[PDB]
Amino acid sequence: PPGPPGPGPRPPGPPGPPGPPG
Amino acid sequence: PPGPPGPGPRPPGPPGPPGPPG
Amino acid sequence: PPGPPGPGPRPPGPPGPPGPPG
């Protein structure tokens, strides 16, 4: 008969924007 | 009596922080 | 049969580049 559903593993986000202007 | 359990797929994280001060 | 698949948790991205000089 049918089995129950199996959560997957945890990639990184993209880089942040450039820092504060000097 | 049930079948065996089915892991799901691995999303990307949020943007990184702003970089260091200029 | 085995059940259906179970998505996992979403790291923050790296810091951005240095801010522009001023």
Residue numbers in the entry:
A (entry chain C), B (entry chain E), C (entry chain D): 1 to 6, 8 to 11, 13 to 24
Task: Show the paper's wording.
Collagen is a critical structural protein in mammals. The principal characteristics of collagen are its triple helical structure and triplet repeat amino acid sequence (XaaYaaGly)n; the Xaa and Yaa positions are typically filled by proline (Pro, P) and the post-translationally modified amino acid hydroxyproline (Hyp, O), respectively. Our lab has investigated the structure and function of collagen by synthesizing an array of collagen model peptides with novel biophysical properties, most notably by integrating the non-natural amino acids aza-glycine (azGly, azG)4 and aza-proline (azPro, azP). These aza-peptides have the α-CH group from one or more amino acid residues in their peptide chain replaced with a N atom.
To answer these questions, we synthesized azPro-containing CMP 1, H–(POG)2(azPOG)(PRazG)(POG)4–NH2, and determined its structure using X-ray crystallography. In CMP 1, one Pro residue from each strand was replaced with its aza-derivative azPro. This amino acid sequence was engineered to produce a homotrimeric peptide containing a total of 3 azPro residues when fully assembled. CMP 1 was synthesized on solid phase and crystallized by sitting-drop vapor diffusion (detailed procedures in ESI†). Herein, we use X-ray crystallography to provide the first atomic resolution crystal structure of an achiral aza-amino acid residue embedded within a folded protein structure, definitively illustrating that achiral aza-proline has the capacity to effectively mimic the stereochemistry of natural amino acids within the context of triple helical collagen. The pyramidal N sites of the three azPro rings in the triple helix of CMP 1 have N–CO bond distances of 1.42, 1.44, and 1.48 Å, longer than a typical tertiary amide bond length of ∼1.34 Å.15 This indicates that azPro's pyramidalization is connected to the underlying functionality in its backbone rather than the long-range forces of the triple helix. To further investigate the structural implications of azPro substitution in collagen, we compared the crystal structure of CMP 1 to that of previously published triple-helical CMP 2, H–(POG)3(PRazG)(POG)4–NH2, which contains Pro instead of azPro.4a This comparison indicates an overall RMSD of 0.36 Å for all atoms (468 atom pairs; H atoms excluded), and more specifically reveals that the azPro residues in 1 adopt the same conformation as the corresponding Pro residues in 2. Taken together, these data indicate that CMPs containing azPro can still self-assemble into the biologically essential collagen triple helix and that this modification does not disturb the conformations of the peptide backbone or amino acid side chains. In this study, crystallographic data verifies that the added N atom in azPro adopts a pyramidalized conformation and that azPro is a near perfect mimic for Pro in this CMP.
